[PDB]
Amino acid sequence: MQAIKCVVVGDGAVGKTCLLISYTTNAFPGEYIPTVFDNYSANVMVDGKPVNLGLWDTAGQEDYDRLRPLSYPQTDVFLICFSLVSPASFENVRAKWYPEVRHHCPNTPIILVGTKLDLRDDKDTIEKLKEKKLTPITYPQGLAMAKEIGAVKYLECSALTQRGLKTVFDEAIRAVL
Amino acid sequence: TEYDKRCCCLREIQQTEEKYTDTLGSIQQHFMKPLQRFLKPQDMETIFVNIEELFSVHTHFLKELKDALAGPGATTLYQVFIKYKERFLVYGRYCSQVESASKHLDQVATAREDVQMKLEECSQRANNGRFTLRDLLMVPMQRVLKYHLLLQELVKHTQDATEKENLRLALDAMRDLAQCVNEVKRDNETLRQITNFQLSIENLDQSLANYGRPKIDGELKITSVERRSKTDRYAFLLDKALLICKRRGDSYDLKASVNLHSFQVRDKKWSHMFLLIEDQGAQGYELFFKTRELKKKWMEQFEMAISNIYPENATANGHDFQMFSFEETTSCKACQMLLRGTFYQGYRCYRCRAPAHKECLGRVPPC
Ligand SMILES: [Zn+2]
Ligand SMILES: [Zn+2]
Incomplete structure (x- = not known):
């Protein structure tokens, strides 16, 4: 029984913490989203076999260039995340996250994760983005980025509805095994 | 809610x-x-x-x-x-x-x-x-x-x-x-x-960290007033000085420490050069680099070093700010936030002793 280390990286407020809380507890955290996700370890059943999955949030580390990399050594799989309703976070995948992760961890598998899937279709979110001269990231755009950075897979999910959530971590585990 | x-x-x-x-x-x-x-x-x-x-x-x-x-x-x-x-x-x-x-x-x-x-x-x-x-x-x-x-x-x-x-x-x-x-x-x-550099340099007059942060190091050719033709050297540029050395095996022997408080930059293979000259001095150096790209890189680093010694607003509002290594927890006189790091964290006014971040010098109340 190996303890598989999965580290979640990406811009602040792409909902890394929300995603982890929603998965580990199952239920959506509710109207108050906790700020803190402490390291979690539990057995998950993937393809008929038990796996000890260790989950790490990086929330709070994003602006600190020398402290940020402390989380990386001995990671088995990265989830590099961006919000589907934030083009700025999408651009930082290629500009910041992928190159930093690749430098520290040459051989570690990456899953590219688009978050906040529930909001891409939301009327009010489409309005306020259009208001800011912006448009949500489409599936083909996300897929294209995943190929560009050599990610194992591109996946979209919603912490709120849990759509595609189980799949993200299943695929992370499969990418290691 | x-x-x-x-x-x-x-x-x-x-x-x-x-x-x-x-x-x-x-x-x-x-x-x-x-x-x-x-x-x-x-x-x-x-x-x-x-x-x-x-x-x-x-x-x-x-x-x-x-x-x-x-x-x-x-x-x-x-x-x-x-x-x-x-x-x-x-x-x-x-x-x-x-x-x-x-x-x-x-x-x-x-x-x-x-x-x-x-x-x-x-x-x-x-x-x-x-x-x-x-x-x-x-x-x-x-x-x-x-x-x-x-x-x-x-x-x-x-x-x-x-x-x-x-x-x-x-x-x-x-x-x-x-x-x-x-x-x-x-x-x-x-x-x-810095410690690794120091161990490889012979004949240092003081701790290398006294010169500040390393900028760039590498091979160059140098001429001096005392020595007119191109001589092969190995140099370490830090904030406060260019340390001109001669490679002796795997170590480097210090020949000259060029003080950057005084010396200023004036703009085929090994033809790419700039001058390191003192305002009114009897000594001047020509620094030759293998390629234009290396020349550009060094000139950029010299600019950074000199900007650290003589920052924007160093003498604003009656002050005389100089690079300073604080040995105790210290707050900036302008913004009240901490000076950050373990050495040469910012500046201290020679006159009034006010500490300040490089970015805050123009905002410190008058000396
Ligand atoms: Zn003063
Ligand atoms: Zn300040």
């Missing part, structure tokens, strides 16, 4: 601090205490660093935090964070050494089966095998970088404009702290580089 979120956030601050302090306690009681019977003092020091200081500080922090939260309106909460900001600078040491600690722990555990087995037992006793000691050692880095996040959220939720303002002071303090910890790590990394 804003007030509901405010109260949830206050509860999370306390509950997560309780959990963290307990995690530190578990490291001390379930790992450190048992391992003392297995590991030499030298090993204990390398692996656990200042975790016991962290436990002491946070035990007291938690008590004061709970007191603040139990008081009417939690109105003194911001004060607790501000009060502990400088005490939390102990994270500078922790985060600078945690890589080395983790590396050393892995090495001892791989070498010694009995230590590996004891570690497995300790993990079982502490947390039912959920977390290794190696993982636990990273929890302090994680925690110190949560404070600014918790406060950022608290500020958002509260509809009390007075409380927002006060909490913003605490938010500023915890962002400042995080930056300080980041810069301490950076300075310790830079100092390792």
